[PDB]
């Protein structure tokens, strides 16, 4: 196959053949994606080492959303690839076309093991992406599961931060997404039920709007406990 | 939060296992010593950890619980239990309180070895990120790679371990069996494939002069015999 | 959460899903019918602070002081234990008798005292309850708090209601001061001493309070009780 | 901290340094003497929950209901505002009259109501205070809570004490429901409605409650009041 | 916590400046709009920030306060005020809430420039650590180094700035005066010494063809004249 | 002077002269201290760059307490030197002879600006040193000032952790040191007044032992608020 397909499919020998034949590892395709992006998103550990040894730019931006290879690996959820790229100096704090850094991508796609690894390596657990969203907010809005929310709360995130543009706290986002699993976790961690967003709505107002009695009762009870 | 059972009759151990915070706090308030282990010598902290009760773990510790208290049949710490069970958040929490993942359980294993043998890949990565030696040899002379090779018939955690800077050809302190030998002995074809690709020396001999190949032949496993043969 | 509109009456009651509870009772569920554990809907409503369900269930014939649970307690006993003041007030406003006794010989004031529910202790006493009222254990509200609450209140409150400090229970015949010591409650010790507690008073076992402090070897105690 | 053994009587009182306070009063400081702000030591002791100093100062001649501060209030008014139940109980146990009025026409129950102090509201009512008692503003405990407390209580509690929901103050002649709306208190609105509040009742200005909801354009309100 | 004054008569602004949490919460509870600015168009958030009232800042934000609301005579944000005053903890807190340090105040300056001109070295370092460009030119055409050279007659923050990868010979967008020129114009001998040691081009001319030396001579400052002369 | 003194006194030209003359920059002195340690502790920025360019080992352990040059700079409180060494790859998490990493050294000596820089660069705010102490505990025990305690609390540290060996929380340590300034900050941040250390003493027990009425009242009041 062509080098791109060989990379995507992980045919090591074939890639090494074309490269030695003269192919430039920095040569992007039509959509401006580099071989390292394809290797990263497909978890081709050996190919990543090889291409980088051949001069591949580790954090080269590419794709319709100007993302780095590590951004792609994080989205796909390849823990081993995240480790590998970071070993070669990939910077997880870099921002992609959607305004997200690796920690936000890990949180919105529920890749709990990657969230843990990134935090253990120094990533700011309260980091706001360019959309004004923190990892906790993304988890509350996108992951209807105990993790990664539980993990993030264990790392002691700021539970009551409101996103930069809508001032929606993680609790606001959980109510808006009908994420009941996360609501309980947030309330137990001290989420402020009366904090108001830019429209003057508290998470409780949102619960009532949604007409969810279980939510209304829990939020009211949390207030009484606060 | 919501009372869905009559806990006024539940004993401390049961309320801990089920995570009934309020009932545990009550019994401790009544005068129960959080350091008092049950018949099996298990502490409330062990029960809370293996059941992933994060809030209770913090409460018990504030009340006097010994963080790395050894207990149970296997003489292990609450962190060892949390690791075996695979509760990443509990591992994170206990380590925050100072629980030491390098401690040895009653079977000679530290946390990284337990995580490896029970295939808890995310915990293996977290522990390494926190400073644990990827090549740490336990008291059985086994490294995490060896444990994965002998007990995890799957791609991970072997692939993750190999991704870090692991020494593929180390032999265990006693038998001098490499990860490759253990894979053969376990009939773990999945890992054998990963090790060979990683450069495992097919001719490495243990103290019996046996190489990984010699063990494959002795087992008469055609699959293994040819794979290693082609590998070399 | 996962569609509470299909939850059984007991669960709907516990979580306060009013309309689901009304719907099921109207459809035929008797509000007096106990569950497997022998607990009535009123018990579950009271402990979960479901004021609305409490009014509704009682209006349906629910027995207010119906005894239930392993400890044979009334819904009020349950509300008192959890520290729900508004519920204690509501139940009582419906004929709930706080003087009743549970499977432990304790009344509401004793329960409110041993669980540190100060606001309830104050309400019950203002409603009539005797500050020195003893349970079937000879224990007084002061003895309980001194023995179970490591904090200024309810103790300090009780002392305000001019309670007799040197009274002793029946069986063991211990003073609030003896219990405080056994519980290692130095906060209470201070309050009792300033209240004129008898540091030499002996229990029905010979122990003279300070004696227990000695047996406990607690430095703080031995010194303050001595002084 | 920085040697409280040298602090003046007012500061020692505020921080509860008992021995320093006793020392200074015995040395000649009159406990009735007000400070620059015209506040007495009893006021400072009450608001800072200094139960011990309260007993001591009163035993020294301190005037219990002495009016002080810009708002001309008594020590009990201060305790009530801060929500110190044990203090309210203690003061009253010394002749403190909760029915007195401060520089705003408010009594203790009105203060406890507007500041959301449920446990105190319950105590005062059980001690005699009239649930419908109106202040020099014609405001009732229900109107205040409905207007100042965005929570189930004290409102829900008051409703339990069978308070008249359709009563209106003097001046403005507003119902607890009108105030609740103006305050944007949807939690209270619900409680009042279920209590049988008059959604059509008009104020001394013509406003018919729902009217204000319309003027407020609040979607939630307009719908629930309508229904 | 301890009531040491009668706050029942204090207005929201005063209680904010003094950090009387309970009294502020009360007034807001009574119906005060936290977004309502005073006569000078200053918001309660500005007052809380410049007075280092961390707890109030969080409370006001939860109540609806606009984090980067511009206000005051100089049309600045609460973060700008906190930066000018030099409250590192408040800068940290506001940035956690999303306050943007790159925003411009009514005098064309961003936070890094304010920190530099008022000599708040710790804040300069924190902002750079958080991603602010050490060479960021404000709307007056001034970099942090230039501001330090023109306004801080001290070793820091110039030494710290020079420690990062700052471009010593950039000229301001309008006058083309380098940090060296500004130091001369300010008679800041302390900084002149630091710049020369750092490699500042003594012959760099501004748009008037004047070099740092030319300005020293025009000022007839013997000290400066000889120092720069010996430097070149 | 000799090269050591020239380094300590910052005589650049003189050091460069001796080095070019043949002196090995890795040559330690009697106490096993390297030229980089002397340059670091004396804030000699230029000399640090120079010695590293000549092969100096950045994190070389030295001195009676086996510390790195960055450890020395942190102790002395040189923010510029901390920045410089970290720029050259110095690892602040390394442990010195006393079991401390840079963040603990920064906290115990009250170097607030360095604590902030280290955290901004990824250091774990709850990091326990080998003595079982966190930065917050060291600040509570050693710094009788608002900072760095206030700063640490802003970064959302775990307020109730007990040290590994004595189980003393930051609040216990503050009481033991008679650090009233810090006590108020900790209580406001939710410090647990009843948490017990290994001897079964709560911070309140310690306050009573100390016979400090101001402390006793504040801790008791905090309990009532909790
Ligand atoms: N850890 C191993 C040690 C051993 C080697 N051989 C036999 N035993 C068990 O026992
Ligand atoms: N920021 C500067 C711009 C300027 C250059 N020259 C005069 N003005 C002021 O105004």
Curated annotation (Swiss-Prot), chains A, F:
Region (Necessary and sufficient for interaction with DNAJC5 and SNAP25), start-end ranges: 1-226
ANK repeat residue numbers: 1-28, 31-60, 65-94, 98-127, 131-161, 166-195, 199-226
Subunit text: Interacts (via ANK repeats) with numerous proteins (via the consensus sequence motif [VIAP]-[VIT]-x-x-Q-P). Interacts (via ANK repeats) with CLIP3. Interacts (via ANK repeats) with HTT; this interaction is inversely correlated to the length of the polyglutamine tract added to the huntingtin protein in Huntington disease. Interacts (via ANK repeats) with DNAJC5 (via C-terminus). Interacts (via ANK repeats) with MAP6. Interacts (via ANK repeats) with SNAP23. Interacts (via ANK repeats) with SNAP25. Interacts (via ANK repeats) with EVL. Interacts with SPRED1 and SPRED3.
Function: Palmitoyltransferase that catalyzes the addition of palmitate onto various protein substrates and is involved in a variety of cellular processes. Has no stringent fatty acid selectivity and in addition to palmitate can also transfer onto target proteins myristate from tetradecanoyl-CoA and stearate from octadecanoyl-CoA. Palmitoyltransferase specific for a subset of neuronal proteins, including SNAP25, DLG4/PSD95, GAD2, SYT1 and HTT. Also palmitoylates neuronal protein GPM6A as well as SPRED1 and SPRED3.
Documented effect of changing residue 31 to A: No effect on SNAP25 binding
Modifications the protein undergoes after translation, according to the UniProt entry: Autopalmitoylated. Autopalmitoylation has a regulatory role in ZDHHC17-mediated Mg(2+) transport.
Topological region Cytoplasmic: 1-226
Phenotypic consequence of residue 72 to A: Abolishes SNAP25 and HTT binding
Section of the entire sequence shown: 59 to 284 of 632
The protein, known as: Palmitoyltransferase ZDHHC17
Domain notes for this protein: The DHHC domain is required for palmitoyltransferase activity.
Organism per entry: Homo sapiens
The family this protein is said to belong to: Belongs to the DHHC palmitoyltransferase family. AKR/ZDHHC17 subfamily.
